[PDB]
Design a protein around this ligand. Structure first.
Ligand SMILES: *[C@@H]1O[C@H](CO)[C@@H](O[C@@H]2O[C@H](CO)[C@@H](O[C@@H]3O[C@H](CO[C@H]4O[C@H](CO[C@H]5O[C@H](CO)[C@@H](O)[C@H](O)[C@@H]5O[C@@H]5O[C@H](COP(=O)(O)O)[C@@H](O)[C@H](O)[C@@H]5O)[C@@H](O)[C@H](O)[C@@H]4O)[C@@H](O)[C@H](O[C@H]4O[C@H](CO)[C@@H](O)[C@H](O)[C@@H]4O)[C@@H]3O)[C@H](O)[C@H]2NC(C)=O)[C@H](O)[C@H]1NC(C)=O
Ligand SMILES: *[C@@H]1O[C@H](CO)[C@@H](O[C@@H]2O[C@H](CO)[C@@H](O[C@@H]3O[C@H](CO[C@H]4O[C@H](CO)[C@@H](O)[C@H](O[C@H]5O[C@H](CO)[C@@H](O)[C@H](O)[C@@H]5O)[C@@H]4O)[C@@H](O)[C@H](O[C@H]4O[C@H](CO)[C@@H](O)[C@H](O)[C@@H]4O)[C@@H]3O)[C@H](O)[C@H]2NC(C)=O)[C@H](O)[C@H]1NC(C)=O
Ligand SMILES: *[C@@H]1O[C@H](CO)[C@@H](O[C@@H]2O[C@H](CO)[C@@H](O[C@@H]3O[C@H](CO[C@H]4O[C@H](CO)[C@@H](O)[C@H](O)[C@@H]4O)[C@@H](O)[C@H](O[C@H]4O[C@H](CO)[C@@H](O)[C@H](O)[C@@H]4O)[C@@H]3O)[C@H](O)[C@H]2NC(C)=O)[C@H](O)[C@H]1NC(C)=O
Ligand SMILES: *[C@@H]1O[C@H](CO)[C@@H](O[C@@H]2O[C@H](CO)[C@@H](O[C@@H]3O[C@H](CO[C@H]4O[C@H](CO)[C@@H](O)[C@H](O)[C@@H]4O)[C@@H](O)[C@H](O[C@H]4O[C@H](CO)[C@@H](O)[C@H](O)[C@@H]4O)[C@@H]3O)[C@H](O)[C@H]2NC(C)=O)[C@H](O)[C@H]1NC(C)=O
Ligand SMILES: *[C@@H]1O[C@H](CO)[C@@H](O[C@@H]2O[C@H](CO)[C@@H](O[C@@H]3O[C@H](CO)[C@@H](O)[C@H](O)[C@@H]3O)[C@H](O)[C@H]2NC(C)=O)[C@H](O)[C@H]1NC(C)=O
Ligand SMILES: *[C@@H]1O[C@H](CO)[C@@H](O[C@@H]2O[C@H](CO)[C@@H](O)[C@H](O)[C@H]2NC(C)=O)[C@H](O)[C@H]1NC(C)=O
Ligand SMILES: *[C@@H]1O[C@H](CO)[C@@H](O)[C@H](O)[C@H]1NC(C)=O
Ligand SMILES: *[C@@H]1O[C@H](CO)[C@@H](O)[C@H](O)[C@H]1NC(C)=O
Ligand SMILES: [Cl-]
Length: 394
């Protein structure tokens, strides 16, 4: 029996959950646009893969408060990124990525949804914008001041003049959670019961699709069996997900089940129709429109290089060469303790883009899902802690 794996003030299980000992790394990879002018004339985009840009994470739980006497527990998962230059392809403060002007594509999308339409329209007309821009890798990630957002900010202070894929994400959390500790049952360990005071979502169609299943992803319940499916709620993905057993792996001396993201997760099916707002009309297998949760921006999540996706997505963008080894999402879990040993959490960020007659900025651009950047959030257990665990286990 292993009731040692429960969150209670005293056990190492708690301390490690509170303050993760193992280092997590995120590597960013960007797609540099080689033929912007030609794309605007309706030609096939060709892109060039650039990276990695490696960041070591700092994690911990804060505002910790036990609930219902040892069964629930509220906390916030802070997270920050420390750049590692010698692990990266170059200096992100100097290196330039040319890609889509996301700020203007966003406000356009807002204008189209009759949000600040005039104000947005007048400014674009006043100050001509380029659809493709060039900025530093650091600017794209952690943010930079944009003309049009600054002009809007003058009138609407609620709207930020800065934009960045990870703007204001360094040293912050993704909201108030209340986790379920193993006290009641070891099965429902580090399981999620609420987020921002809410036990479900509300932006997806079906009650089913709005459910919050599983753990935050950083750990699992002990005594896993190959036959069972494992649910996760990655907040940044804007929906729950499951992973299924792939095969047997060894990480140091420790046994590990390899759980991967199956292709059912983003497949164009009636099951997943409830993710395709408004009227269940999906773009095709292997992508996810997350405009709603990303503040009306035309953001489409997918896997790297449209792996596990419809082929015409891959065909649309020259330079998209997907393969399983490099681009799949996997996680090697010690079946016994439900602890992660090795994992590559991988996914892409794309932008939906189409020609618009009212907006000359769009030129004659093709209708497509435009890949901007993907990443690999990884972890790997070292000898010391491994054999410590391996001896601790027995
Ligand atoms: C990915 O997912 C996302 C989200 O899941 C998808 O987006 C959803 O789908 C589409 C995207 O285009 C979109 O549907 C359209 O919504 C439009 C707007 O809906 C909102 O606004 C409606 C109208 O409100 C204005 O007008 C009303 C009076 O008629 C009035 O009540 C309002 O106050 C408002 O007034 C405006 O005020 C401004 C002035 O402000 P300033 O700028 O400050 O000066 C004026 O400039 C403006 O002209 C106007 O007067 C409202 O009724 C509605 O409830 C929403 O709140 C609609 O316009 C679209 O309607 C279309 O159909 C009509 C049929 O009747 C057609 O005649 C017309 O051509 C029109 O095009 C349509 O419903 C969703 O809004 C959007 N949802 C979200 C949350 O973003 C996205 O598409 C997906 N992408 C992919 C690739 O799959
Ligand atoms: C996200 O957020 C996290 C957490 O905040 C960021 O990580 C931290 O970033 C800060 C700010 O950049 C880092 O501080 C800098 O550290 C560098 C590294 O140099 C090291 O070695 C120096 C030797 O040359 C040493 O002097 C530095 O400081 C040590 O010594 C002092 C006293 O002597 C001691 O008090 C410190 O604790 C250190 O032990 C340092 O370790 C350093 O070069 C920087 O100094 C410059 O910049 C500051 C302004 O920030 C300026 O005042 C100085 O004059 C100098 O110009 C600075 O101190 C910190 O190291 C990071 N923390 C961790 C844990 O890594 C992260 O960068 C953010 N990421 C993103 C993407 O936004
Ligand atoms: C992603 O893709 C983009 C677009 O292709 C690339 O961005 C270009 O990057 C190149 C360099 O890689 C940039 O060119 C460089 O510009 C520097 C500054 O240019 C201004 O200032 C100089 C004076 O120094 C003026 O002469 C010039 O007119 C500009 O106004 C220059 O200093 C560099 O010049 C040196 O280049 C080589 C040696 O490096 C020599 O041949 C030259 O003699 C000279 O010493 C250089 O030309 C260019 O500006 C970028 N374009 C855009 C649109 O931003 C990215 O590189 C690519 N990303 C990655 C990671 O590869
Ligand atoms: C997080 O996620 C990213 C990927 O999204 C990872 O980065 C990749 O890491 C993988 C694994 O190492 C890399 O795959 C390797 O590609 C290399 C290709 O080399 C080129 O140049 C050589 C000449 O030296 C040519 O021979 C070759 O054809 C290529 O043109 C190779 O070094 C590797 O090939 C060897 O291993 C593979 C095993 O799969 C064998 O198939 C080969 O025969 C050979 O033995 C390998 O293919 C990939 O390139 C990386 N990509 C990027 C963009 O960095 C991170 O590593 C990952 N995980 C973590 C924890 O960070
Ligand atoms: C999050 O929660 C649940 C549980 O994982 C997921 O819904 C489940 O989906 C399956 C279909 O594959 C359901 O099977 C059903 O069985 C019932 C009972 O016999 C039957 O009434 C149905 O016709 C169907 O056969 C399963 O029961 C269902 N769970 C519940 C509680 O109804 C859901 O999809 C997950 N969502 C996300 C976003 O991860
Ligand atoms: C997503 O799936 C839907 C339905 O599962 C597909 O729509 C079908 O399209 C064929 C012709 O290609 C029609 O004969 C069917 O009647 C359609 N069915 C429904 C329910 O609409 C569609 O092909 C898929 N979408 C994409 C973009 O490939
Ligand atoms: C738990 O540890 C001890 C229990 O006595 C106490 O000093 C401390 O305040 C508690 N901290 C948290 C985060 O629960
Ligand atoms: C988790 O604990 C048990 C284990 O299966 C389950 O019966 C129960 O419904 C769960 N608890 C809560 C509060 O949801
Ligand atoms: Cl290993």
């Amino acid at each position: 029996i292993e009731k040692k794996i429960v969150l209670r003030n005293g056990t190492e299980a708690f301390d490690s959950w509170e303050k993760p000992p193992l280092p997590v790394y995120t590597q960013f990879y960007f797609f540099n646009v080689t033929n912007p002018e030609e794309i605007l004339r309706g030609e096939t985009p060709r892109v060039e893969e650039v990276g990695p840009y490696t960041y070591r994470e700092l994690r911990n739980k804060a505002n910790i408060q036990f609930g219902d006497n040892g069964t629930t527990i509220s906390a916030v998962s802070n997270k920050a990124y420390v750049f590692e230059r010698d692990q990266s392809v170059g200096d992100p403060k100097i290196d330039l990525i040319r890609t889509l002007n996301i700020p203007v594509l966003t406000v356009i999308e807002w204008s189209q949804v009759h949000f600040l339409r005039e104000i947005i329209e007048a400014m674009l007309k006043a100050y001509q914008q380029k659809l493709f821009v060039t900025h530093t890798v650091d600017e794209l990630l952690w943010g930079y001041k944009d003309e049009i957002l600054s002009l809007i900010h003058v009138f609407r202070p609620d709207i930020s003049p800065y934009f960045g894929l990870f703007y204001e994400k360094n040293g912050t959390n993704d909201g108030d959670y209340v986790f379920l500790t193993g006290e009641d049952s070891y099965l429902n360990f580090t399981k999620i019961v609420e987020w921002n005071g809410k036990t479900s979502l509300d932006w997806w169609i079906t009650d089913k699709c709005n459910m919050i299943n599983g753990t935050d992803g950083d750990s699992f319940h002990p005594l896993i069996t190959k036959d069972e499916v494992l649910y996760v709620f990655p907040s940044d993905f804007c929906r729950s997900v499951y992973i299924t057993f792939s095969d047997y792996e060894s990480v140091q001396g420790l046994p590990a089940f390899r759980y991967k993201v199956p292709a059912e997760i983003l497949a164009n099916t009636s099951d997943n129709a409830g993710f395709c707002i408004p009227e269940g009309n999906c773009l095709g297998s292997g992508v996810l429109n997350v405009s709603i949760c990303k503040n009306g921006a035309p953001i489409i999540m997918s896997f790297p290089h449209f792996y596990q996706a419809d082929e015409r997505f891959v065909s649309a963008i020259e330079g998209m060469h997907p393969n399983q080894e490099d681009h799949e999402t996997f996680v090697d879990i010690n079946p016994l303790t439900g602890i992660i040993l090795k994992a590559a959490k991988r996914f892409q960020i794309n932008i939906y883009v189409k020609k618009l007659d009212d907006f000359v900025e769009t030129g004659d651009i093709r209708t497509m899902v435009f890949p901007v950047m993907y990443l690999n959030e990884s972890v790997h257990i070292d000898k010391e802690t491994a054999s410590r665990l391996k001896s601790m286990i027995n």
